[PDB]
Amino acid sequence: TVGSQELFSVVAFHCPCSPARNYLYGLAAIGVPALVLFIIGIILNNHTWNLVAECQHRRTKNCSAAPTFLLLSSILGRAAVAPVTWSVISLLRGEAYVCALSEFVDPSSLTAREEHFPSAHATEILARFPCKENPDNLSDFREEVSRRLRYESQLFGWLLIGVVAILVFLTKCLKHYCSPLSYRQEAYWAQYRANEDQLFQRTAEVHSRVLAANNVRRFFGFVALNKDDEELIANFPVEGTQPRPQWNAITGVYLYRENQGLPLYSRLHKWAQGL
Amino acid sequence: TVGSQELFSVVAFHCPCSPARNYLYGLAAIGVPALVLFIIGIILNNHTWNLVAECQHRRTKNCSAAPTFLLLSSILGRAAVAPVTWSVISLLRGEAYVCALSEFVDPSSLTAREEHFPSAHATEILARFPCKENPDNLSDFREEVSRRLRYESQLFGWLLIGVVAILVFLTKCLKHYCSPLSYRQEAYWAQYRANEDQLFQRTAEVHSRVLAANNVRRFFGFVALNKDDEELIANFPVEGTQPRPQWNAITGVYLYRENQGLPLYSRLHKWAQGL
Amino acid sequence: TVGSQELFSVVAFHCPCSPARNYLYGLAAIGVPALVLFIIGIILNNHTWNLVAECQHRRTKNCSAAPTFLLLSSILGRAAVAPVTWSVISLLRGEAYVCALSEFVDPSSLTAREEHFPSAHATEILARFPCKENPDNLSDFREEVSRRLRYESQLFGWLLIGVVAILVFLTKCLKHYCSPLSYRQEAYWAQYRANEDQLFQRTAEVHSRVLAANNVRRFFGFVALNKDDEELIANFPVEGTQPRPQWNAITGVYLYRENQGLPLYSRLHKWAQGL
Amino acid sequence: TVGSQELFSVVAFHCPCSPARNYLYGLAAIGVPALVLFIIGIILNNHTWNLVAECQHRRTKNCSAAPTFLLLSSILGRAAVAPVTWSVISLLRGEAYVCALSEFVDPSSLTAREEHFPSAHATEILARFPCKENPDNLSDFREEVSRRLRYESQLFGWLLIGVVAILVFLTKCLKHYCSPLSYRQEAYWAQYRANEDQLFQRTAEVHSRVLAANNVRRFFGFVALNKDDEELIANFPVEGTQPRPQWNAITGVYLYRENQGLPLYSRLHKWAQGL
Amino acid sequence: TVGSQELFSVVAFHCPCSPARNYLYGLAAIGVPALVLFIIGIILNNHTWNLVAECQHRRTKNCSAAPTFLLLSSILGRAAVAPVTWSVISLLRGEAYVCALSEFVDPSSLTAREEHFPSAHATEILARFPCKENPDNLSDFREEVSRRLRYESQLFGWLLIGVVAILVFLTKCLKHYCSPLSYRQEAYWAQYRANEDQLFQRTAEVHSRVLAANNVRRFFGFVALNKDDEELIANFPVEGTQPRPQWNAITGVYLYRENQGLPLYSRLHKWAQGL
Amino acid sequence: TVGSQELFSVVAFHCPCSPARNYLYGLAAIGVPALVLFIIGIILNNHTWNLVAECQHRRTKNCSAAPTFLLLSSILGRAAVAPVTWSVISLLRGEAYVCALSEFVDPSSLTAREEHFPSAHATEILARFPCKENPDNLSDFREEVSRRLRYESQLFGWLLIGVVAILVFLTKCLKHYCSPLSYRQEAYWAQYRANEDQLFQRTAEVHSRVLAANNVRRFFGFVALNKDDEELIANFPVEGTQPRPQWNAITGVYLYRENQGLPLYSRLHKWAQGL
Amino acid sequence: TVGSQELFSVVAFHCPCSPARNYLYGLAAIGVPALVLFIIGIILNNHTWNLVAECQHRRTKNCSAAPTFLLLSSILGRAAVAPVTWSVISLLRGEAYVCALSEFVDPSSLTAREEHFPSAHATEILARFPCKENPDNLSDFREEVSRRLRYESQLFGWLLIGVVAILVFLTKCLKHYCSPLSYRQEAYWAQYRANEDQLFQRTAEVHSRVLAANNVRRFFGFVALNKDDEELIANFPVEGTQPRPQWNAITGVYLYRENQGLPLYSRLHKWAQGL
């Protein structure tokens, strides 16, 4: 609240009342926060790196661009919410759009009201309306064009949130309509991927810690463990880790080939059933 | 409250006092929030995806469009409450409707009051009434037309909530009147569907976790479990998962065929009794 | 309190000071909230669906319309409190009734006070009294007619709450006077219906859960239970559920036939004693 | 908050309204805090000292400058966030940039407004605009140039945060695209480095303490231990510490050579597998 | 906060507006608090006394001035932070520097503004500017020279904090670049010195207490112990303390000679391995 | 705070604006609180009485005046902090010094400003400046001389705290440079003196209490003990106390003679090793 | 605080502005509270009664007046702090001294200022200055003489606290310089006197209670005890109390004769060793 206002004050809009310049600032303050939120949505997502590790060394578009497209749909479903929550919250606030298109209004009524105002004065005085710099001779006209431009901004924001709503609906019906499986089995697959990822993180931490303890014990002569780590060395000994081709056989896109009719829900499962 | 007001301020109405434009903004601010709430009501509902998975790969309208209609009635019963709670709360507030139909009033009394006001000035000055931009010569007239339009809005909101009340009553009497069973057995069926869905989610998480643990143990040499997961591996071993036609035999619309007189309340129950 | 005022503000009355229109708004704001509260009182009641399931597939008015009438008396006793608590709280507040019948007053004293006011001006200026739009020449007259109309509203509200009081008294003496049994046995019957309904809901949840667990165990190979559900599978096994004619023999109106003199308090009890 | 304001007051900007001087102060107050935050980001990072210990006594650029480049990428990923969070928070506040480029504006409109103002007076009066020292004859002109310069500052800040966003995205895709391994194995490697570093710190403290206790016991005749340290002497005796070439074999850049196909995740692991 | 302000009020600056005197006061209030903080940084550091005990009775610069230089680098790293945090917090506040160099400004513009002001009046009126004692004829000129001098102070403070940042960076790269060992072994050495110092303080307190108890018991006939001290006498008896040449063999600079390849991390360790 | 202000109000300065008198009051209010704090620093210190008991009956300056000088250095290190914290807090407040030397200023500018003011009036009006009793003709002159005298006071306070800082640094380097031992052994000696003094106080209380209990039991026939004192009589019986020459052999200056090379850290230790 | 102010208000000073009378009131309000605090310091001290019981019936100044002088030094050390904390807190407040010596000032400047004021008017108007009863013709003169008299009071208070500080220092060096013993043995003696006095009070209460219980049991037939008193009768029986010459052999001044070289720290110890 307090720190939220103290951070929202610097990011707040300040319309530069200048023609052919304010619309560039409006485009920046709309798009560039939406762009950085979009790119950190791709950054925060981990399955993007699964995709790039799938296509870099394998160089395999052999299946199709469609499993990559469904993966990318999950990417943008995690990611692209952040640009579109910013674009609509700017558009319905309308400040960026009035600062954008204040210098594009038909000045005919303004020229009739301002005793034949010339386009050199008209475009510049149109740009000065979002700073409320209109005089008393044009304050009502500035309020009228400000309300019409606020209308256009809010209508564009509502149309954009409507079309992204129908877009997310259509990609859900596409994902369930181009599905190679049920929706109960897709839920089982989602729970399998969550269980495998959580179990794999936990066992990677445990196996890495046991390997580190064996190396340290080889160095010093002993190790410094809590009782939990003493139980870890007691329970799960290691002779050696896993080779890098065997590690490469695990990563990649989540396949759904079915070995001998029985399904394989991930590449680790494919690798385990392959042995 | 505080954050509720801070979010309600941006979504709040701002009537663009301009003719043949303000009614489009009123239609947008009524319908498009109602449309996005309606479509996310279809999104949040999971049985929609049961319906689309029933009609996509089976392509079966073989039973009727009436079980799909009862399913869709449940869909809209979960979903369509959100557009209609928005349309009435906008209509009884009346701001969207006065901003809509301020530019449609018979201007005859306005022309008589405003010394033969022409329709070029009359429609534009009618559009400026929701901004309270009427002068002292027409402030009382603006209050009169504002109260009459607020009357029309509130009457339409009350009629719409009345007709959706009689509509939900008629679809309940339709559902109980076109019911192939009792209402105690329908309650037993609802409790069966809740128990099967909850038990199936829990056993899907458990079986997925045990399969993931077997794959990980095949990879590393062990697994990292809490004591609960150690009990899970101790209690429920798995040799193999279930094939995809057997998974497809589970999904679909909730049938109520009765094998040999004895009822089958869901497709899993049909599949279990079939063996 | 705060949210209560924030919700009561939108539902609050706004009298459209316009003749032959304000009484329609008063009728709407009285009746339509009373109508929707009445219809959701029928919706929230579950025994309505018992009645419609009794008369739909059996099509049996064979006993009489009088057990249906006593059932409907219980329906309206649960239900119709909500329209009548709304109609009196509107009537004693009087705003809906003054907005209704402000445009129906005898304007003879108003014509004498307003220097022969014509009925074109008189009816419209009568409609403008609930907005307190009377001038200083008629402010005292507006206060007089407002107090007389508030009298008429409050007297009608008190008469309506009195007549619904005598109505609920007469239907209680009818129910105890057309009773086929004592009032201690009617209390025993009410406690029997409560015990049967609660026990039947609990055993329906339990039996549905055990059937769902048997189907799931047939599918996966095991089930995911808490210790309570493990006790449930341990205690109450199921071979098969109950057929639909046997389920139809349970539903219906609460009979009080007496098999061989010994009473049967519900159709489940009739069905159990019949075996 | 309170102490935060008391510390932010001294570091706050104070634009010296003087030509060819204020831009040096703006460059200082932007860059030098960014420079000291950058250099303490290199200081706080410990892997910088791993790099300098790798290149000092070994003098080995024998592998490539690319593992040093990936290490330095991790260095700047930990470090360089602090200069760029300062440069943008200064740039979007705009005070440093208006104090920088107030003395560079085209004074043609200022000379036309100020009755042929000469460049000796014009540059100095341009420098006095960030102190709001313009008179009433040029207050509106000062507001116009201040808003245009605030536009230029905020646009440069948004462009810089956008380009560092695309830069961090490109270096992540470079790191995953020039990766000699998977991304699951890179996660296993990160967890191995964390486990080895934590276990090595704990066992270094323990082994150092046991060596210190043996030296002290050699001096006095006994030692002063808590019960934990008594357990430490009871569990891990030491005959001698490790020689300095063996200590040098541990430090250095994190290699990923693979001895006989089996991977070696750190130089301690390389040293342990080498024996 | 409250006591902090009550202590900061007396140490606060009071510029004596007098020529060739105020700069001496500014130099005092900058340097002398920085000098006393520097000298108590040398006082609070204990390794300074290790250095002076190393060079006093041994009189040995036999190794080099470079281990003394690295020790002194640690001394100033603990110590010299306190003068430089004072000099910059005075310089960025700027009061000491404006009070210093207010009596050194070029008075040519002041002589032109003050109707040929002579240097006898000009230097004295320049000294009176930090008390804001300029009249209305020179208040704007005083504000201009005050802002320029505040610029010079803040620029000097930023340059000084930048150069001490690069200085601490260069001495860290010197310490790691002139290191006779790794950085992991330097961390092991730091943990060894911490463990030896803590264990030696604890065992010095324990051994001193046991010796005192033996002397007191020799005097009175018994001792007054808590149960902890009773355990101390029970566990660690003493026959005699350690001789002064053996005590001198412990103190001195932290050597890193390596006896027979195996390292010796401190002089106590050298003394223990020597036996 | 509140009581602190209520006590600081009476000790607060009240400058008697009178020539050749106010400087005596300033000297009193500076020195006499510093003198009483210095003498109670000698009073609160207990080792002063060790020194006077060493030199009174022994009359022995036989060792040197240098162990007495090191003891006195410890005396003043405990003691003399209290006068010097008072002198600087008075000097930097400056009130005592302006009240001192207000009657010593060169009155030449005052005589030129006050229309040839005579030294009979000039010295008395100089003394009245610390009461702010200067008129409007000399208020600015009084402010100038007050600021110059406040400068002189604060500069003297800073120089005095600087010279006592270098003094305490030089006596620490003297104590470590004229040390007959290490600094680790000096720390062991300090811990020995603390342990011997604490153990000797506790055993003096215990032995005195047991002797008192034996005398009382000889008088009454029994004693009144708590359980702790019952344990004290149970554990440490006494036949007789220690003779006065044996008590005199304990007191005196802390010697560091070394009997047969082995050190003796106090006279009790010398006495115990002597037997 | 509140009650402290309510008690300090009545004891507060009220200077009777009357010549040759106000100084008697100042002498009373200084001395008589100091006198009553001094005499209750002698009253609260118990060793005064030891002294008077030593000199009354024995009538023995046989040792010297010097042990009585050291005892009296302890008496005044406990006692005389209370008059001297009152005299200085009155003197530094200065009200008693200005009320004392306002009627003693040289009236020559007052006679020159008051148009040859006669000594009949001058002494009386000098006495009225502490009530601030001087007119505007002498308000500044009253402030001058009030500040000079406040100077004289505060200087006398500081000189008195300084001389009592040097006095308490000299009597401590006298007590340690005329000591017949060490200062460790004096501390042992102080702890012996504290232990004997505390043990003697406790055993006097216990022995008196047991004697009272035996007398009561001789009267009634039993006694009423708590469990603690039951333990007291169980543990310490009494046959008879101690005779009055044996009681007189205990009281008296604390001797330090040494029987056969071994010391005797109190007369009870002398009496016990004598048997």
From Swiss-Prot, chains A, B, C, D, E, F, G:
Chain ranges passing through the membrane: 22-45, 71-101, 149-175
Segments for region (Intersubunit interaction): 183-220
Location in or out of the cell: Cell membrane
Membrane topology listed for this record: Multi-pass membrane protein
Effect of H207A: Decreases intrasubunit interactions
Catalysis: reaction(s): ATP(in) = ATP(out)
Positions of disulphide bridges: C15-C99, C17-C131
Signal sequence, start to end: none
Hemichannel docking: annotated span: 114-121
RNA-binding among keywords: no
InterPro entries xrefs: CALHM
Keywords: Cell membrane, Disulfide bond, Ion channel, Ion transport, Membrane, Transmembrane, Transmembrane helix, Transport
Site (described: Not N-glycosylated): N137
Topological region Extracellular: 13-21, 102-148
PANTHER family on file: CALCIUM HOMEOSTASIS MODULATOR PROTEIN, CALCIUM HOMEOSTASIS MODULATOR PROTEIN 2
Subunit structure of this chain's protein: Homo-undecamer. Two undecameric hemichannels can assemble in a head-to-head manner to form a gap junction.
Purpose: Pore-forming subunit of Ca(2+) homeostasis modulator channels. Mediates ATP release from astrocytes and ATP-induced Ca(2+) influx in microglia thus regulating neuronal ATP and Ca(2+) homeostasis, synaptic transmission and neuroinflammatory response. May form intercellular gap junctions. The gating mechanism remains unknown.
Protein name (database record): Calcium homeostasis modulator protein 2
Organism: Homo sapiens
Lineage summary: Eukaryota, Metazoa, Chordata, Craniata, Vertebrata
